[PDB]
Design a protein around this ligand. Structure first.
Ligand SMILES: *[C@@H]1O[C@H](CO)[C@@H](O[C@@H]2O[C@H](CO)[C@@H](O[C@@H]3O[C@H](CO[C@H]4O[C@H](CO)[C@@H](O)[C@H](O)[C@@H]4O)[C@@H](O)[C@H](O[C@H]4O[C@H](CO)[C@@H](O)[C@H](O)[C@@H]4O[C@H]4O[C@H](CO)[C@@H](O)[C@H](O)[C@@H]4O)[C@@H]3O)[C@H](O)[C@H]2NC(C)=O)[C@H](O)[C@H]1NC(C)=O
Ligand SMILES: *[C@@H]1O[C@H](CO)[C@@H](O[C@@H]2O[C@H](CO)[C@@H](O[C@@H]3O[C@H](CO[C@H]4O[C@H](CO)[C@@H](O)[C@H](O)[C@@H]4O)[C@@H](O)[C@H](O[C@H]4O[C@H](CO)[C@@H](O)[C@H](O)[C@@H]4O)[C@@H]3O)[C@H](O)[C@H]2NC(C)=O)[C@H](O)[C@H]1NC(C)=O
Ligand SMILES: *[C@@H]1O[C@H](CO)[C@@H](O[C@@H]2O[C@H](CO)[C@@H](O[C@@H]3O[C@H](CO)[C@@H](O)[C@H](O)[C@@H]3O)[C@H](O)[C@H]2NC(C)=O)[C@H](O)[C@H]1NC(C)=O
Ligand SMILES: *[C@@H]1O[C@H](CO)[C@@H](O[C@@H]2O[C@H](CO)[C@@H](O[C@@H]3O[C@H](CO)[C@@H](O)[C@H](O)[C@@H]3O)[C@H](O)[C@H]2NC(C)=O)[C@H](O)[C@H]1NC(C)=O
Ligand SMILES: *[C@@H]1O[C@H](CO)[C@@H](O[C@@H]2O[C@H](CO)[C@@H](O)[C@H](O)[C@H]2NC(C)=O)[C@H](O)[C@H]1NC(C)=O
Ligand SMILES: *[C@@H]1O[C@H](CO)[C@@H](O[C@@H]2O[C@H](CO)[C@@H](O)[C@H](O)[C@H]2NC(C)=O)[C@H](O)[C@H]1NC(C)=O
Ligand SMILES: *[C@@H]1O[C@H](CO)[C@@H](O[C@@H]2O[C@H](CO)[C@@H](O)[C@H](O)[C@H]2NC(C)=O)[C@H](O)[C@H]1NC(C)=O
Ligand SMILES: *[C@@H]1O[C@H](CO)[C@@H](O)[C@H](O)[C@H]1NC(C)=O
Ligand SMILES: *[C@@H]1O[C@H](CO)[C@@H](O)[C@H](O)[C@H]1NC(C)=O
Ligand SMILES: *[C@@H]1O[C@H](CO)[C@@H](O)[C@H](O)[C@H]1NC(C)=O
Ligand SMILES: *[C@@H]1O[C@H](CO)[C@@H](O)[C@H](O)[C@H]1NC(C)=O
Ligand SMILES: *[C@@H]1O[C@H](CO)[C@@H](O)[C@H](O)[C@H]1NC(C)=O
Lengths: 124, 398, 397, 121, 405, 124
């Protein structure tokens, strides 16, 4: 119970132990009209992230395994260099260039190609 | 052999500005009440850099106050239908006033102050009296960030509002921040722990104001000691016009301020304190509301000094105000029956500077946004980015 | 060995208060959703829910709605400020003459009109209390059935009981999204066009024991009431410009009803002793009179001809008060522009509002009770569909 | 129909679950907007729990959290064949947020990380 | 052995009407900035059938402009004390008494109004109350993009020449309609969409004369208007705070107009016959907002005769038309509301492109007069390519796959 | 080929580009209130569609297999005819009579009987 954003200064490997704490607190007459569009933005801010999580073969929360091979050009770092000597804030900075490449590769990467073959496979 | 994997809830946030909602434990009513015990989460090994001068919260708080205040004169009685003698701070002015009926008129005996008077409002703007039911009593306000966002707090005892913060925490809601409309002197603000500190957008530039935060609070009493009376003259139909510091503690504080000034101007130089040179009346004077009647008190008795390296103030009243340089809008304060007494804490100063070893310091004024900055220096809004992709050498089951 | 299992959609509710929305029959009625051509009502077998019609939030949201929606009916209409002037009047009606503002600022205008005795007073009525705004002649004041409903995540339970005093356990309960379309009728002392009780009549009070507490009666047999404004009027629209313009000028069923009312009323008072009926003890004109709007015209009658008793039709004395400050709202006063031609009004009485002595008097005062004559059935609940329960089920990893 | 088995037994009530879940989703009109805005944050708040719990798509879902006897130690027949959900939610009411907290972490956290480990093989 | 399967994101839409929002390039403060480059997706092998006459987008834009403009008069000074008897002489030099800053005093002041703003005993008092415009705000036209929200889309008829009705073979879809000019012009279209190939003629009913006939140019026609007098405005103090601001031929080329008209008469073509005479005539009469080419130019209202343009006869085989300022106006025929335009310091000169015509005709050779009346027609000269659709992304279809048990 | 790109193509070919209309299905003071209701409407129309996917055994985006048999009475046709010689707009009109029959059949015939089945089945 390290709290919301608790493991921010911790390594990536340790910060993935406390994932369910930043995810549950992700949705948490004039004048009052200024609190309404904050509520409204809060859900479109949340459905946008989960549509991706849906277009990607995940939906299932917190962690998700993929069939996208990580080409070296994205990082070229031993997982020990990443999980045990780096924070998520640092990592998001390194890959910032290739992130939207990965996002596009994910959806096409399996589900477009993965859900379709299950359709073929689930025929027999 | 390594593969991408999707993580949700990863602790990643970016600086951002957005609309914030309100939290309140009559303007405060309709503002979503506060949780009986808030949660504050420390961010270990985290260092976040703040820039109190480029904060959007202040300017969202400032734009909120201006636009919520005019709503406090909308359902109130309009004073558009508005011979004197006495020096005398007030003047007993007579005038013909319309009654319920258009034809008939009414003579009146009223008492206005020298500063409100034809009244000065007509030359500039129209005027509306405040609703006598609503109150201007300061009550703590918490500013909160909606879902998908968070507020970072610098848990540093001594912080000038800029640079890196080695101990950062995050909260959904700021502390109970006093929206106290005071000038020159900050009243009921946040008290700095241990040593007092000094803050200015640019230290080199004199024109930039210089905000001082006390650690030892200064007790201050002001009182309107005359028992006034209210006769509700009928300016119908329906609408109705309501016609009529310790010197022992101050030098201890100042003596800490010269030590607080420290190396900023040099140890050797002398520090002189002088009254404001002039400007608008809201700058020249420690203007604030007390008990519903607006106080304007001369602080020349506090700021007269010349400090080498090694207490009552006058007060006057204005019946009407155009706060925030807002023209077109003017509020008449309906006076209150009885004697008025207040006891507040002086919590900080706003100071300006002059253009050898001579340093002159004046009481502060100008934008009221600076006083909000005396509360919002510890805060900044961040956007939560919970999606992350990384390699972990797991593959999806097929 | 047992394991938790999450169920979603379990029938579990708690009492709750929230914002409710509006419906407008088959179609302030501008954005109200049309009602389902057939609403749906679901009975709750083996369910007992307890009601407290007197501690119900629905009434206090409906009442706070009518007062505020009504004010909107006065915002695009002509303000009357120039009509607080000295009146030179002569002889219930009055032919008052007065000088009036024209389109121009300088010029003036002499005009005569026709006002009633209640709307005027001797000069040593509204100006004394408040400013005034005339109603828009374009809007209609015919009462229309309104359905109050609960949004998604909530529901409303209704007591499916023929005889119910509004409190205690309800054995037959149903739930609906929407209250039956309801008439927000503005009546004094006497309820008009309300919900008629099934089978025997009953009586309802927050506290029987406190005579200060009003006593709501709901008829079973309806009582027809005919009233009329029988003079063919004409109105002249004097030009208070620019643009704005002011528009200047059976007891056979009552005894059978009371006879049924006495018995039910006597049961609480006891079988041995008798009750007395008397006229209103006083107060504002709104309690003393059976005041309601009719044909677009506001209408008042002393009901002393009905309430005199110890246990062919009897007319009631009937006057008109053109200006009103309904809901004890000061600062806001409405002038009702009269209508061309003679007005005939026909409705039935459906209940009574009665007060008690320290004998029965016609009630008045707060209008919440009028809504409670309809909202006794209903209460709002919140739905909690998440359930965890043990079963023999296991999830495989 | 909606809320049909509110007076029925828990066992008979779980048959008709899809009826309460399908129906689970200028001034003056501003009151109707907050109603339908609350409606979605009222719905997603429930679906977030179903998400961090490993269910999400399921009206009934099974887990591997052992039912601790401290919580309503009663025979299985009593709970399903001799109780209504309104009675049950009252007895569990003390332990419900314990269950809720145990559901998210006690398995899914060690259960998702387990498959993450198992999917590296 | 077939089974159903749910498909999500299937390309299926239906005609529908909903609330649309605004975008304003890079009352126009609440409009989200337009994407620096929008995206347009062609719909191959798709034929969609349009009915510009039954467009909802037009009647939403029109109701928008009406309710948008009323907001432009709320924080502005109300003129109520300007209904007073006017002592006038010949533009007219009128004198009148005035309310001052305080309640007691009065003030004599003289101003300068137009013959149309006044009537012998101002015209508005007879009709409605009046509010002057805020001098801080301006009426310059900015391109406005109407956009469809998520779950909806807007289809565009790509084809160079389109009547506004019937089947469109080349269709596309975008989130936002192009930069459409919200300009209220009368008789002649100003700064509008110029047709790609040949000028189009469009009317709700061609055979019916009573339905106004819209023309769309392909060659723009330049036009110069000017208020050539250096005015000075004096702010008399109708306090407190509030203050009233007391106090022209327009030109188009003829060499292009003869060239333009000849394309117009050939554009009529079959609709009235190849072998027929075509008549042009001045306005038959009606409201002053129909009889003249009314438009706002540089904050003042210019009400010009088109009689010089419209008289011609066409067998099968630098002219200038002047103007008088209109002063107060109740646009959109809205009564109870009235705006007085505060005059401006300096001389006004503005030049806009003419891009089309609004014409009415008489029933029986046929004659044509300048059109006018409702401003909805002005919007339909831009929204002819557009219609709104909902997106219905759920699809069920037979397949041969089965899920686990 | 972009949003709504395959509207004129055969059903078989249009299902390859499902993720382009699905990703653009949520698309990432008065007067401004008109733009607020729009994005409030945006989420409730999206959630109304996805509530069905929820009570159906889908959740996973774009394509989902079921166990509801395709009844002959509803659009009895050659598979080649349906997917190789028909557009979705044409198909949505032909099954139009039987759609809400299928919608109701889906929620009960497939998930309601399927998860209670698993509930009984996962007993040992
Ligand atoms: C907080 O407030 C303080 C004031 O209290 C303010 O500090 C001032 O900052 C400005 C710049 O931001 C300083 O102005 C610059 O000063 C340098 C150096 O000046 C000294 O040396 C020259 C030459 O000996 C003397 O004339 C002068 O009196 C000083 O002794 C100047 O060189 C700068 O001018 C150059 O740049 C300009 C660019 O626009 C040119 O227009 C100009 O012609 C000059 O160009 C020449 O020099 C360049 C190198 O500087 C060279 O690259 C060019 O090719 C060309 O040869 C400029 O005037 C000022 O001195 C500071 N004053 C103090 C008291 O500190 C802070 O800026 C303020 N903080 C914030 C955040 O705003
Ligand atoms: C609905 O309306 C009815 C009235 O119409 C209200 O009923 C009254 O309720 C109050 C209390 O809520 C009752 O007052 C209490 O009565 C007790 C018993 O009184 C009887 O016995 C004594 C002794 O023999 C006699 O003197 C008396 O005349 C009665 O015969 C008293 O014991 C109470 O006083 C005690 O408590 C107070 C506490 O403050 C002490 O100060 C006293 O010294 C004393 O110890 C008390 O007076 C009253 O009798 C009820 N009247 C009736 C007619 O029922 C209901 O309250 C109201 N409903 C609601 C919700 O308010
Ligand atoms: C009590 O309810 C009755 C309905 O049973 C109300 O009587 C109805 O009154 C309305 C208007 O007050 C009548 O509508 C009017 O009809 C006339 C003639 O067609 C038409 O000219 C008007 O434009 C308007 O539509 C309606 O006919 C009438 N119904 C009956 C059956 O008489 C009565 O007003 C209610 N009483 C109160 C106090 O609200
Ligand atoms: C049709 O489009 C023409 C453009 O060809 C518009 O003319 C332009 O009008 C704007 C304002 O209406 C002018 O901008 C102003 O210019 C003056 C002088 O430079 C300046 O003082 C103002 O601050 C503002 O910038 C612009 O110069 C002018 N351009 C031309 C070429 O005339 C015309 O207004 C449009 N017609 C209608 C009816 O909207
Ligand atoms: C302001 O007024 C308060 C009284 O309201 C003063 O506080 C008193 O101080 C004296 C000694 O200075 C004590 O004996 C009293 O017990 C205090 N009373 C209260 C209520 O605080 C205070 O000293 C005044 N401030 C100044 C600067 O004189
Ligand atoms: C600062 O806070 C003090 C309390 O420490 C306020 O003093 C109160 O003022 C209200 C009315 O303004 C009185 O009802 C209380 O009795 C006062 N309490 C004390 C202890 O003096 C003071 O008003 C605040 N100052 C400002 C400017 O808001
Ligand atoms: C799909 O339809 C085609 C027709 O378009 C069917 O093809 C026919 O098949 C029969 C025997 O199965 C032949 O006798 C015909 O000559 C064929 N006609 C054509 C035009 O190909 C085909 O059978 C259908 N597919 C299925 C699976 O039934
Ligand atoms: C990723 O690696 C591939 C080779 O497998 C290469 O084509 C591509 O350029 C790399 N990614 C980027 C962003 O360059
Ligand atoms: C009341 O009015 C009805 C018509 O609405 C009429 O038939 C009846 O005779 C009237 N009765 C009395 C007693 O006025
Ligand atoms: C009450 O009056 C209505 C007409 O408004 C009439 O139809 C109805 O029958 C009356 N009530 C009863 C119980 O008959
Ligand atoms: C009329 O305006 C045009 C631009 O459209 C300009 O070129 C021309 O100079 C103007 N007329 C005169 C006489 O200058
Ligand atoms: C096929 O569908 C029809 C409805 O079109 C339904 O009535 C029938 O029962 C279905 N077939 C079978 C075998 O149930």
């Amino acid at each position: 119970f390290l709290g919301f954003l608790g493991a921010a200064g911790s390594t990536m490997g340790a910060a993935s132990m406390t994932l369910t704490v930043q995810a549950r607190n992700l949705l948490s007459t004039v004048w009052g009209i200024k609190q309404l569009q904050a509520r409204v933005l809060a859900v479109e801010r949340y459905l946008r992230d989960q549509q991706l999580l849906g277009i990607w073969g995940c939906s299932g929360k917190l962690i998700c395994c993929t069939n996208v091979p990580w080409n070296s050009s994205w990082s070229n770092r031993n997982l020990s260099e990443i999980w045990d000597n780096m924070t998520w804030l640092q990592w998001d900075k390194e890959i910032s260039n290739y992130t939207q490449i990965i996002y596009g590769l994910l959806e096409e990467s399996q589900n477009q190609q993965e859900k379709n073959e299950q359709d073929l496979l689930a025929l027999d | 052999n390594l593969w991408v994997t999707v993580y949700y809830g990863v602790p990643v946030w970016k600086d951002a500005e957005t609309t914030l909602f309100c939290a309140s434990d009559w303007a405060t009513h309709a503002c979503v009440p506060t949780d009986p015990n808030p949660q504050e989460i420390h961010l270990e090994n985290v260092t976040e850099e703040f820039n109190m001068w480029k904060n959007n919260m202040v300017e969202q708080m400032h734009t909120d106050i201006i636009s919520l205040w005019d709503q406090s004169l909308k359902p109130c009685v309009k004073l558009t239908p508005l011979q004197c003698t006495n020096r005398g701070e007030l003047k007993n002015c007579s005038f013909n006033m319309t009654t319920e009926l258009r034809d008939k008129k009414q003579k009146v005996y009223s008492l206005f102050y020298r500063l409100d008077v034809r009244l000065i409002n007509c030359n500039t703007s129209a005027i509306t009296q405040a609703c006598p039911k609503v109150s201007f009593e300061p009550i703590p306000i918490h500013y909160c960030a909606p879902a998908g966002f968070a507020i970072l707090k610098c848990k540093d005892k001594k912080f000038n509002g800029t640079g890196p913060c080695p101990s950062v925490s995050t909260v959904q809601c700021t502390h109970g921040i006093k929206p106290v409309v005071s000038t020159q002197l900050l009243l009921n603000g946040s008290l700095a722990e241990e040593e007092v500190m000094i803050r200015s957008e640019n230290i080199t530039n004199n024109a930039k104001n210089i905000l001082v935060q006390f650690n030892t609070p200064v007790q201050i009493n002001c009182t309107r000691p005359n028992n006034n009376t209210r006769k509700s003259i009928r300016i119908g139909p329906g609408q109705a016009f309501y016609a009529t510091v310790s010197k022992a503690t101050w030098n201890e504080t100042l003596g800490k301020v010269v030590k607080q000034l420290r190396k900023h101007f040099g140890n050797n130089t002398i520090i002189r304190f002088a009254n404001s040179s002039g400007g608008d009346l809201e700058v020249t004077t420690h203007s604030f509301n007390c008990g519903g009647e607006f106080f304007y008190c001369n602080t020349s008795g506090l700021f007269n000094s010349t400090w080498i390296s090694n207490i009552t103030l006058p007060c006057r009243i204005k019946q009407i105000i155009n706060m925030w340089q807002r023209i077109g809008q003017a509020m008449y304060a309906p006076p209150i029956q009885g004697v008025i007494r207040c006891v507040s804490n002086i919590t900080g100063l706003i100071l300006t500077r002059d253009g050898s070893t001579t340093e002159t310091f004046r009481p502060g004024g100008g934008d009221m946004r600076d006083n909000w900055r005396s509360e919002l220096y510890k805060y900044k809004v961040v956007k939560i980015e919970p999606l992350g992709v990384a390699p972990t050498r797991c593959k999806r089951r097929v």
